[PDB]
Amino acid sequence: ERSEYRRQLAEYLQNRMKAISPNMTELIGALVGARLIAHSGSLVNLAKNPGSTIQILGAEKALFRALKTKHATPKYGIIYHASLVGQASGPNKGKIARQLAAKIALSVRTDAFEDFPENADDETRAAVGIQARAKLENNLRLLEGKPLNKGVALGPNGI
Amino acid sequence: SAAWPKAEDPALVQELLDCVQQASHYRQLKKGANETTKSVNRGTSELVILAADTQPLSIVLHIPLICEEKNVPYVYVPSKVALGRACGVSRAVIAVSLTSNEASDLNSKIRALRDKVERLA
């Protein structure tokens, strides 16, 4: 019974996130969006954050440890358990984390400050999220389809 | 619309972009919306110039809230491309934030410029 209630709570969290912030829900999804809203406190409190802040929300202990001891800061925070940074591998993971955090900052500012005529469909209420997700998936597949370095193909002699 | 401290007079717009170019050569300038937000939140920012040609205008509307909380003057120029190549960027810059220091002719220009922005408000 606890599992059934937790499943319907996850469905409710998804529906309420698509109600509140359709752009960010179209970008990363309802659970990671709810984690970001939770850490920042509110939607208009998340919207006042730069993209570099939204990149490393949640990784703050490692961040301030590294900043105070002149180590190297963490590359991402809560954003790591989104969908779109999990397809990459290698340094393209950190590059996609940067780009995704910037698009999340734009989408949260749009979902927290833009007005709508109240007869506005959800497909046009999540327009910035749709456009940013399509562009960001194109940039991800370019970063993954970057070819490897050419080499000299040697014969059996060494010639 | 939502850009109510608009700089519409072209003499004032030319003065704002000339001071932006001088601060850019002094490396006293923070370019971009995220870097502008960081400078305004940290409180090092003396004046902040947003652009009104932003196609979703709501992606720079959070900076008026932080400037109302931190009491720094913000103003809207017409063209983001003009702001961009005023900073010397070769991109479209939608928000810029120019900072202050101990003693400069540039700091005197900053004080006079925020007096003119307070005349707009």
């Binding site: 301030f64 900043l67 105070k68 002149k70 800061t73 | 940290r42 409180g43």
Partner: peptide, 30 residues
């Protein structure tokens, strides 16, 4: 630069709190 920025944020918060406390401790009125 990152270390100096964090130390400057901490020191600016300390200055704001100390200046508030100093004003609270200690042709004006017509």
């Amino acid at each position: 630069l990152g270390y100096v920025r964090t130390m400057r944020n901490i020191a600016a918060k300390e200055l704001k709190e100390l200046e508030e406390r100093y004003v609270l401790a200690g042709p004006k009125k017509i």
